[PDB]
Design a protein around this nucleic acid. Sequence first.
RNA 1: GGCCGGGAACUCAAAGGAGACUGCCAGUGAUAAACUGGAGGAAGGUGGGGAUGACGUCAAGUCAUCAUGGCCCUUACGACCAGGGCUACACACGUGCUACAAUGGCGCAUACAAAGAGAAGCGACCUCGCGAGAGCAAGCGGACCUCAUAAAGUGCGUCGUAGUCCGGAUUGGAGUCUGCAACUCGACUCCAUGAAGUCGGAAUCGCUAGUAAUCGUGGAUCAGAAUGCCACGGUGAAUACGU
Lengths: 99, 114, 100, 79, 127, 151
Amino acid sequence: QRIRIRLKAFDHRLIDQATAEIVETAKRTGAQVRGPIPLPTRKERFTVLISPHVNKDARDQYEIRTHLRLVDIVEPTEKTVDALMRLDLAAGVDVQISL
Amino acid sequence: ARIAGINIPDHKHAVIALTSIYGVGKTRSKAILAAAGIAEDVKISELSEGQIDTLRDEVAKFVVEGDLRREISMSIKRLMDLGCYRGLRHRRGLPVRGQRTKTNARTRKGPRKP
Amino acid sequence: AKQSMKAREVKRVALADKYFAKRAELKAIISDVNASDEDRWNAVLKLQTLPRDSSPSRQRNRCRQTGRPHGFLRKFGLSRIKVREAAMRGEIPGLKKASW
Amino acid sequence: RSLKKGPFIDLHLLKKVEKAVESGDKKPLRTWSRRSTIFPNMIGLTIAVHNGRQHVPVFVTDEMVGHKLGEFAPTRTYR
Amino acid sequence: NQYYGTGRRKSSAARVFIKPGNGKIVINQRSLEQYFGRETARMVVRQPLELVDMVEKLDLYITVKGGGISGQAGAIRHGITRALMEYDESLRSELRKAGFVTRDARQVERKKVGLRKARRRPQFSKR
Amino acid sequence: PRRRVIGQRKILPDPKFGSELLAKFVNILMVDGKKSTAESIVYSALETLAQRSGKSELEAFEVALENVRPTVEVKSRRVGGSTYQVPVEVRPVRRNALAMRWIVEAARKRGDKSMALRLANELSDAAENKGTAVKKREDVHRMAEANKAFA
RNA sequence: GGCCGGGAACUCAAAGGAGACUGCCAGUGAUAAACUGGAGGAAGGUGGGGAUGACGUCAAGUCAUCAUGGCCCUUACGACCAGGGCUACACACGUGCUACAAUGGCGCAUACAAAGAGAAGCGACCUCGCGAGAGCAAGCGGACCUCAUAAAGUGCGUCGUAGUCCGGAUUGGAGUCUGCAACUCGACUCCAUGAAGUCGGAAUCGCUAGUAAUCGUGGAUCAGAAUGCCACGGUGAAUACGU
């Protein structure tokens, strides 16, 4: 069949680490993979007032950025699928696997 | 040409000219001319007596002029006599649909009085 | 905020959770076309006997640390003041000051 | 207000109205429900509507049908 | 053979492919007169060739997306200049002095807090 | 300004003809960033004008300008508590700019049917030495001559 | 028809790198620091825009976000409830929106964007209604589906300087939706009515370039309620002799 992995994070160095790890663990268990593809980043913005009373100018502006990567595995086997399902990653990455 | 008790212009297109009646707008004008069977861009000075009579027949299907005025006046008088909130607004001369009266309201109040 | 306003909010959310399904049923009855035309009257007359506080539109979003009824943000559950405090201390992952 | 819903009325008011009409005579009936439509079976009665401080008595007639009870008890004082 | 150029302006990107012979222009599967119905836009797209006498010697196949009318026209002009330089490599001096080699780095300024626009302030009163 | 040197912006030439003067005329005529409308108006007016005089549009335009270009103007000075009108010479770019501004201002004040018609009538009157533009030029020269003692 | 087999070249997406420093040439200058011109180059001298606010001043603002010394009330200055008010109206001031028209109003039909939001959410195709909407129902936790059709522009007709085929306050009658519930006091639709106003006295405000002016688009709060606030692109000027 074909396996798909989608990875989300707030920090790009962390996301690159996780991606490299998955690619290597797939390549050592005998499968073909199509390299990670960078996808559009999401920028969410907020704007608040910074005084406890009247003053109406004098605001602050904040952002959150969301980084996203996609990896495709074309020809899997039982050993590889177990190898993926038996892997752990950092405490700030979100992983979705689709069959 | 006399239509409903009044004289309508002669150098105007028909759809504009028929609007001079108290009770007829652009939508009703278009509808009437469609029922009569005449183009909307024909001057009233290029019509015939039979065509004008057809238009009179069309216009006769609505409520216009004195009858309409009496209807509206009775509608207002009913509230004024009943004495509800809207009636009191009517017989004091202030807005009836809940608008602000701290400023503005000059169409119901008239120019300022020092 | 006073200590009784928060109590009002807790009571509201509780009752709204309790009576959720009954109201949806009655409202589907009243909305549905081709009804007996007396079942409609009955459902309308019964929907107003339930407690007023059981409607989801009697609830007010408040700050989870102070109780402020103004300046609420939905992504965070907090008001502008406490959002800024936590952001500068470093307690909101991924958030930082922006320019462009 | 949508016609597919019909008018609105309060249940306690409706029950009191039925009792009064079927039993005949009645002294003024006190009501805080200013949001209720006036139905044809109310004609002839005296309903006292709240306005904030007092109860204003209204003697219902036949031209009031389809009004809300609150329109016959104004809420502000101006001279 | 083909010669290629990329052009950019305000928010627009243009791909230009040029070949030899029988001067004819096609843009987004249409003709110049069908696409640009403004004499200014047409003159802009035509300028570099009138400058270097090759109006009736090259076929042009163009694509463009983003922006409006003027932005697209300018992007096309820049792309043509680049493709021509690739083709010959000795027209660079003349095109430079004309001024078509530079990229125009003008963008829309952002809106700012407390103003009504980028630079426009509300109305002030002393009393 | 106080400590500045400002260079000259470049202006594209007109598409139909090839003159920068006509481009500046279009610019002075435009409103709200609508260059197409201004170009339509100017081209139509010059078309209807070329006939009335049997010469090229450019020649008609130049002859119209040469009767409205000014030479001397008056500035205001106040150092002794009183206002004095001091005559000064005008330089070429300002000559052209003032002529164009006055022509358009006079045109907008007429009472014909279309803006192109008003513009064409004004240009013809100027070539014949009549109209508000020439009146304005004469008034400026009169004021400058009446104050020659303060040169 | 990127529809299909394919291609990895080009747009574009997003990670590592290169580049701009008075570095090179000529003139002036205290055998200086610097200044004024020129070459190459996408860009030249702080390339353009943000963030970044010294010691202090005004007993400046906020005990009603919160925290806190002192005073004050405890069958009440503390609880709970249904109705009303914060929306009043002789009048004065600040900030805005729409206009007073032919560089325009109305009818037909046709190019070209950017940035965002979405599970008690965003709601296609189809049918019914003149319309606001209603019924049935796919897809999507999204470079894939939906919101979602840019408008000013261009082409062809008509109006002909009139308080108008300009403007759209006010008021009558009939409806739709959210919501236990729209009298006081909601938004939107349809037929009808068609006010002031023809460019504004003494004063007075913003703006030096992709700026002013002008045209449309999105989001936060939010059951419903923007002409306000925070963001995005299109067309695109005039002028700076001088202190």
